[PDB]
């Protein structure tokens, strides 16, 4: 990914994360737990869905037969037809290849972007209360129970509540 | 106490190409090139005329094999390889132009 | 066949599809996906897969 999160500083994906694209995995006195983030997951889904809406569609132009499979047309005009058709085949094959390559590059970079955005959103939330690990983990200095972890996920987390304890723990 | 971010992956991904790499494995992929044919003329909702032994140009002159197609009405006209325009041997001048006209005639 | 509906026809039958491209017949007529040489062009609908 262009941003360097997916297949980047985040070592690998979670096969257990079946409910979402992106999620949180925590460690605290109470144990371990994993939860998907739907806002980031939905943003990625909506954008991929948009590409498919664009690519799966009508070319309303209807083309009639201009040659004949049973009784071949004159050879001069027939050769012009075939040359023109083969030229169009070449253009469209090239177009299709480039479209899919371009869209795939963007799709991968897009997913990588959404992962990065979620990470940075969390980093800003708990400023001066935690430090970046480098594996996509935040080491939190104060005690953070399941209600505290769920507040981070929820986005209600209040850093000023735990700042004195966390800051002083450095 | 720490919280960790991640993304899901699958043991068996699907390979795609990008601008920068061949065979990149992704969670998901959907084919954009149709390969599946239906081996029938799917004619629901259209008045269809299957000419069979009658050649399209025979509908105008009327050799015996075209007796049932002398005044046909159609949205979709189907020519077959076995179709013949003639009984007494011969052929039309500018035959394919005329076929193209009759194919669009209704 | 009056039990299926399609708008793309060729000598071998009917191309029923919503896909943008097809590799079935370069002389298909009606309202058709555009013929391409390639048998397959997979479009990514998800992130890069990075398994453990």
């Amino acid at each position, epitope marked *: 990914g262009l941003f360097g999160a997916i297949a980047g500083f985040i070592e690998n994906g979670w096969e257990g994360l*079946i409910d979402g694209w992106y999620g949180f995995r925590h460690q605290n006195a109470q144990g371990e737990g994993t939860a998907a983030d739907y806002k980031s997951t939905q943003s990625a889904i909506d954008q991929i869905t948009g590409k498919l809406n664009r690519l799966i569609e009508k070319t309303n132009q209807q083309f009639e037969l201009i040659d004949n499979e049973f009784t071949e047309v004159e050879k001069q005009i027939g050769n012009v037809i075939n040359w023109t058709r083969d030229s169009m085949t070449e253009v469209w094959s090239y177009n299709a290849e480039l479209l899919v390559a371009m869209e795939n590059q963007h799709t991968i970079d897009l997913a990588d972007s959404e992962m990065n955005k979620l990470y940075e959103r969390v980093k800003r939330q708990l400023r001066e209360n935690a430090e970046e690990d480098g594996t996509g983990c935040f080491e939190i200095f104060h005690k953070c129970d399941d209600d505290c972890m769920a507040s981070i996920r929820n986005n209600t987390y209040d850093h000023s509540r735990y700042r004195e304890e966390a800051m002083q723990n450095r | 106490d720490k919280i960790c971010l991640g993304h899901h992956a699958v043991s068996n991904g699907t390979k795609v190409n990008t601008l920068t790499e061949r065979g990149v494995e992704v969670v998901n992929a959907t084919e954009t090139v149709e390969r599946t044919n239906v081996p029938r003329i799917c004619s629901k909702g259209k008045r269809t005329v299957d000419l069979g032994q009658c050649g399209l140009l025979g509908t105008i002159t009327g050799p015996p094999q075209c007796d049932q197609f002398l005044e046909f009405s159609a949205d979709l006209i189907i020519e077959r390889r076995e179709g013949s325009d003639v009984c007494y041997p011969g052929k039309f001048v500018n035959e394919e132009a005329l076929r193209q006209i009759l194919r669009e005639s209704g | 066949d009056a039990n299926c509906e399609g708008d793309c026809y060729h000598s071998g039958g009917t191309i029923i599809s919503n896909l943008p491209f097809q590799n079935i017949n370069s002389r298909a007529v009606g309202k058709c996906p555009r013929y391409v040489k390639q048998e397959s062009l997979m479009l990514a609908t998800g992130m890069k897969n990075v398994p453990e």
Partner: antibody
Amino acid sequence: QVQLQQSGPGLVKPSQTLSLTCAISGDSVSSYNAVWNWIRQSPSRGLEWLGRTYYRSGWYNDYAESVKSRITINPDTSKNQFSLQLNSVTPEDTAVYYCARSGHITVFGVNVDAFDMWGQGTMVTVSS
Amino acid sequence: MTQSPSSLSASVGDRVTITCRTSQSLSSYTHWYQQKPGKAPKLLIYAASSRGSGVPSRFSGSGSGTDFTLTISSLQPEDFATYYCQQSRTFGQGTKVEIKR
């Protein structure tokens, strides 16, 4: 033609254990493309998800916070079934219990928790 | 998930619209179920706008932000059921559809 068939007693004494089984046919309890759930329904509480199990190169379980302390859902890969075990039942656990497959139906490979097939239900009464 | 109305009567052939109001809006995660008496719920609409397997064309779903709608274009006697929407693991309280005949 997936079919979920449910068994287990519909009468449990208060404080004891409710035990139900869902036997799967047409699909595998350890399939990558399935999630196996329990849901209950009461005229009061309505429809309430209880928990699940699934296999993705290892077994996972998730449970509803309301029953987390009492509940176990285990796969049996010998009989292609999965069970519900609910400990210390109270009259508030009286309900119809359904097993259900999700995650067969997905948006771009993400389980969106669509329950595409359900068992017939087991009516459970907690009473002495 | 919160449904409106709690119940309704409508004549055969009527257009019926049911609404789900959701805490948080995600098109992908909201699905609808139809439950007939003594039976398990059957999934009608999934991902908000997609019809379940075996589901007739008169049923359709729409979504807009946090508001989601199930529509029966022409009501039929056999559609007598209670309808529940669902987002993630929470089920709306249901809408009872009774037929006026």
